[PDB]
């Protein structure tokens, strides 16, 4: 789980958390306005020390139409089942220790991505 900023309703500014001492609940107040709203996530901050980020969420379907990207036929797609597909490393800095590939289907209207 993560936590999102929820802007104010009148002034449209950041809402800081506030522990209601009276009703013993969690509120999000505005410094400028006096808007209040009852919380539902019951969380404020999370820290990911390991930074376990799913590289698939960053990969886009447009990577398929890459003229300078390798292609293989031995890893067909799942949904459409097309044969041609691309593969590449994380292509992101801070890579801890892994060259695990991220196969992406090379076919229009599919944009599927997987990993083996």
């Amino acid at each position: 789980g993560f936590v999102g900023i929820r802007f104010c309703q009148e002034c449209n500014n950041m809402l800081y958390p506030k522990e209601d001492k009276e009703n013993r609940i969690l509120l999000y107040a505005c410094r400028n306005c006096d808007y209040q709203q009852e919380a539902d996530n019951s969380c404020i901050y999370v820290n990911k020390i390991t930074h376990e980020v799913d590289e698939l969420t960053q990969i886009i379907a447009d990577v398929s139409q890459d003229p300078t990207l390798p292609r293989t036929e031995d890893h067909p797609c799942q949904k459409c089942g097309h044969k041609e597909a691309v593969f590449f490393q994380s292509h992101s800095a801070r890579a801890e220790d892994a060259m695990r590939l991220y196969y992406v289907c090379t076919a229009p209207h599919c944009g599927h991505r997987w990993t083996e």
Binding site: P67, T68, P70
Partner: protein
């Protein structure tokens, strides 16, 4: 193009003709990073183990 160029000097044929015809193209240092350059036209395209088979340009 080769036949028309080999008879240059005599008539009027020059490099501007090749550029206008759409055969050559100026790629700068910044754009050279997003093209599959090829070294020779014949050797690197015939039919072998599937390397890229998506060459976009080729060096002279």
């Amino acid at each position: 193009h080769i036949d028309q160029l080999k008879e240059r000097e005599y008539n009027n044929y020059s490099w501007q003709d090749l550029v206008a015809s759409g055969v050559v193209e100026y790629i700068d240092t910044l754009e050279e990073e997003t093209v599959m350059l090829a070294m020779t036209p014949d050797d690197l395209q015939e039919k072998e183990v599937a390397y890229c088979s998506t060459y976009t340009h080729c060096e002279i």
